[PDB]
């Protein structure tokens, strides 16, 4: 009852700020035009609201500033993965407000009847109706990913008509417009792009495609970083982000596990289900993860489906762990040296809570790989523990965090340092169960 | 004749752009006021010039954007270490222009005689004369580092008076003013600062102080990064940058070799010459240096005095090299393993050209340390070669780059990859002598 409200404590606050700014502008422009009777008042209010929307709807779509903002506490508080579907909501309110604006001014013109404004307004109305119609989900559900882009590129014409349609619109558009164009000028053909080539595409079960793309000769990424994959064979101008699910110590390839959860990522699987093709990835982005390897007995916890970076992190952890098992050639002596300058872990736990393994079968097979690779060493010491709960049937059902944390605190391998990747409700439950045992809780953005 | 002009090909271009913008504004405001006779014309021209200067003189002093700009090709083209002494030049031209402005308007008032403008102008003139007098070099040459800061903080009053003195000045000040205040609001008490404490201060010969400051528990820097040291015992509000001269693999301390080349860095040596005191360093900044360790037979070259980061780079190189000499406990077998995931070098050359070893005696002793540490291994293989030329008397005299590069190309340890740290004249000579041998030349910013 309060956990559901706790997850959306930020989306609700952003929507409340939005509706509050709209009611503020509406009432403000309805007070300053009270003498005009009920038809220019509504129309001028909606005019101010349009001035705001048609201008900031573009500062939402800054996928160059979103990457930098998505690494910080600013991302910890307000959601930035919802920017596409907050932008769609700003588009829907632009359409509704412009409709009531047109209707208000039409009724006003009729009352006055009992060349910039009206003709440029008919032009704006036709353009916004075209963007509305040719920006629905049916345009991209069918394999028309280039009709959407072109017929939705008319926001330039919308802004152009809107400059010499609204007298004071340019003042609004100046800041978000210049920011949008400066970001479009920062990112060009080979700004950060790298024309990589798929070495192979496996089709894992339950509609998830595994892309082994060539690693560009100089590509350095921390474990847990993502990249904006682009495949002109699926969609020419779409750049979708995906977490790299391979440890950086893997020098030959870059893995990407792409789950069929949309209309592009689904088009990928549908096209390869019916390889060396073109791709243009865009850089590694992500939060620094040195807090995990410069730790002791890290307890990684992951809920839901945002645990693709935990695959990369666990693979890197086990790579660095196996990289400190030395064997002498002469006398075959096999010793283990100390924690050395990259990883300081003596133990690692990985607790994965989920509803099921619907799309995460590759994840379970990868964890099985790691557990079996290090399990033949488990007679003297265990380094990676894997708990995988399912909550819908591996120990079925939710954890009992009191018991789990008490067992973690039973054996002492150092200063336990919990890390979390999930919902803020479970984050509250975790910090509550965690401050009792003195574990240094964390929560990663990814 | 053309090398001297080649070094200053960017300072001369910046000064030419500056003088051109001034002559543009002067002539533009002298054309639009041609009817007013010779006294309001000059005064309004100088007014426009002041509007530009008094506004952008502050965008020069953005030591928060300068760190980000100093890592890129944008820093490769235009100089950013001259921002302090370009700012001083903007201050001198502000004073000269305001003097001729005052004189022009005084002669105009006299011609008209044969309450904002004039009184606020007397106030601006007195404030600018105070900043001019109490911002000379004599204020900080004596140990008055706090009189300078306070009596030079009156640029706030100068801007305040200038808003309601010039009608259109606020339009100019809006962008640099908001940028300056946003940068001052980004950096607060503990934004990136770390209240470190000096563990020790050695006084090396020839007026250079070696600060072994405690390494804050979580401080990660690449080899070759700098930090903005601050010592409230020398100067309370001054933040001078210094390159860290210790390899990151040194976990206990952070070294800083501070040469007495000014009035603060000199005050440091003079005060300690006549330890646990307060310091507040500000983060690691610098260009990525992975190109040196992910290389083969890197030929580092350093000219002049900007080779403090080469001390850190060489110490890190030799640390990582000695970190791959394994010895088995049982049979005492001592083997060397392969290039492993951090450093790929099989050889390193370090060619240091300078005029003399005036302040760089610590550097020569450090290179002697490294050469002697690895020289007892030189019977089977040499990893670090050290050439140190002096050009004023170690092989005295300039190198013969044809011979040096031919000797480098004689022995084949991989794909030679020259790196350079020096003047653009020597950079031209190097790229010329380097494209002949197919060495992949580089030039670092630091
Ligand atoms: C850092 C990061 C890493 C991700 N890694 C993966 C991964 O490895 N595998 C995976 O299957 N999914 C991953 N996603 C989520 C998502 O499935 C993909 O990022 C991709 O954007 C989906 O595109 P789509 O066309 O299939 O979605 P659509 O069908 O276009 O839309 C469906 C959903 O995807 C969202 N969406 C649409 N376009 C984008 C976009 N450009 N960026 C982000 N969200 C978008 C919509 O808001 C909606 O919620 C990741 C998301 C982020 C932020
Ligand atoms: C990245 C970097 C690393 C440096 N590392 C070292 C180092 O390890 N040892 C060393 O002796 N010097 C170093 N310097 C140069 C310089 O000596 C110091 O940075 C310091 O700023 C000098 O201050 P000062 O008060 O002695 O100079 P001043 O007496 O105030 O001025 C003399 C000269 O220093 C310049 N200067 C003044 N204040 C600054 C400032 N805040 N930042 C930069 N330049 C300034 C002036 O333009 C002038 O050319 C470095 C410079 C940079 C950019
Ligand atoms: N900034 C934001 O606003 C963010 C929002 N989210 C939220 O993520 C949610 C995703 O849905 P979902 O992933 O189901 O939410 P959860 O993250 O709560 O579900 C994740 C897993 O946690 C399990 N779980 C829930 N409560 C407990 C508990 N008390 N003890 C142990 N395990 C528990 C669930 O099992 P069961 O489902 O069986 O209870 C589920 O398998 C969205 O509602 C979204 O709002 C995600 C990231 C940040
Ligand atoms: N962005 C910019 O504008 C930058 C400017 N600089 C320039 O750095 C200069 C510093 O003075 P300085 O350091 O003396 O200039 P140099 O860097 O040219 O002097 C560095 C060393 O190189 C040696 N040297 C010069 N020419 C040759 C050559 N042809 N072959 C071999 N060795 C050579 C010099 O020896 P000798 O002195 O005995 O000839 C000197 O010891 C300043 O003039 C400044 O303009 C520095 C960085 C960037
Ligand atoms: C984009 C969306 C849109 C649309 C569709 C529209 C449509 C329209 N419209 Fe508009 N508008 C607008 C947006 C718009 N619009 C704006 C923004 C403005 C401004 C406001 C103010 O007031 O400010 C206007 C404004 C306006 C005005 C006022 C004038 C000026 O400029 O000042 C008028 C009259 C109008 C009309 C109109 C009409 C008739 C129409 C239909 C045809 N308009
Ligand atoms: C005028 C204004 C505007 C408007 C109204 C709109 C409206 C809209 N919209 Fe928009 N968009 C925009 C402007 C806009 N828009 C922009 C600017 C962008 C960006 C593009 C790029 O980035 O290039 C977008 C983008 C976008 C996107 C992205 C693409 C991808 O996928 O990646 C999407 C999905 C959208 C949707 C939408 C919708 C649904 C709507 C409703 C109709 N859009
Ligand atoms: C800061 C430096 C400075 C200074 C010192 C000055 C000083 C002066 N001044 Fe000055 N101004 C100025 C800066 C200045 N200034 C400016 C910036 C301006 C504006 C320009 C225009 O025209 O725009 C002026 C402006 C001005 C004017 C015009 C008016 C208006 O506002 O419009 C006048 C009359 C004056 C006067 C004067 C005088 C009498 C003096 C002495 C006492 N002037
Ligand atoms: C009004 C305007 C102005 C003016 C006129 C000036 C003028 C001047 N200036 Fe200044 N500055 C300034 C504004 C200014 N300024 C600023 C804003 C700054 C910054 C500060 C801080 O950062 O805090 C400076 C800063 C500054 C500095 C830095 C400090 C250190 O050391 O670190 C110096 C050195 C200077 C000098 C100068 C001179 C010499 C002059 C001539 C008088 N300058
Ligand atoms: C449908 C709910 C959408 C909620 C959007 C939250 C605010 C996103 C801000 C993104 C800023 C770039
Ligand atoms: C005395 C010569 C000064 C030359 C200044 C060059 C331009 C510096 C630009 C700094 C921009 C932040
Ligand atoms: C300006 C009017 C804003 C209305 C916002 C409504 C949001 C509904 C989210 C479901
Ligand atoms: C606006 C007048 C600018 C004059 C610049 C002079 C620069 C001299 C550098 C030595
Ligand atoms: Zn042995």
Numbering used by the authors:
A (entry chain C), B (entry chain A): 182 to 295, 319 to 478, 515 to 633, 667 to 719
From the article:
NADPH oxidase 5 (NOX5) catalyzes the production of superoxide free radicals and regulates physiological processes from sperm motility to cardiac rhythm. NOX5 catalyzes the electron transfer from cytosolic NADPH to extracellular oxygen to produce superoxide (O2-) in the presence of intracellular Ca2+ ions. Like DUOX1-2, Ca2+ activates NOX5 by binding to its regulatory EF-hand domain (EFD). Each protomer contains a catalytic core with TMD, FBD and NBD and a regulatory EFD.
In the consensus structure of intermediate state (Ca2+- and NADPH-bound NOX5) determined at an overall resolution of 3.3 Å with C2 symmetry, the EFD was not resolved due to its flexibility. To analyze the EFD motion, we performed 3D classification and refinement without applying symmetry and identified at least three distinct conformations (intermediate state 1–3) with large spatial displacement. The local resolutions of EFD in intermediate state 1 and 2 are insufficient for modeling secondary structure, whereas the intermediate state 3 was resolved to an overall resolution of 3.9 Å, enabling the model building of EFD. These conformations, with the EFDs manifesting a trajectory towards the membrane, could represent its motions during NOX5 activation process. The EFD moves toward the membrane upon Ca2+ activation, shortening the distance by more than 12 Å between EFD and TMD. The preTM1 helix, which caps the NADPH-binding pocket, uplifts. The NBD shows a minor displacement coupled to the movement of the REFBD motif. These conformational changes synergistically remodel the NADPH-binding pocket by enlarging the binding site and altering the local surface potential. Finally, the nicotinamide moiety of NADPH shows a weak density in the intermediate state 3 structure, suggesting the flexibility of this moiety as observed in the mouse DUOX1 structure. In addition, the PhosR region becomes flexible and not visible upon Ca2+ binding.
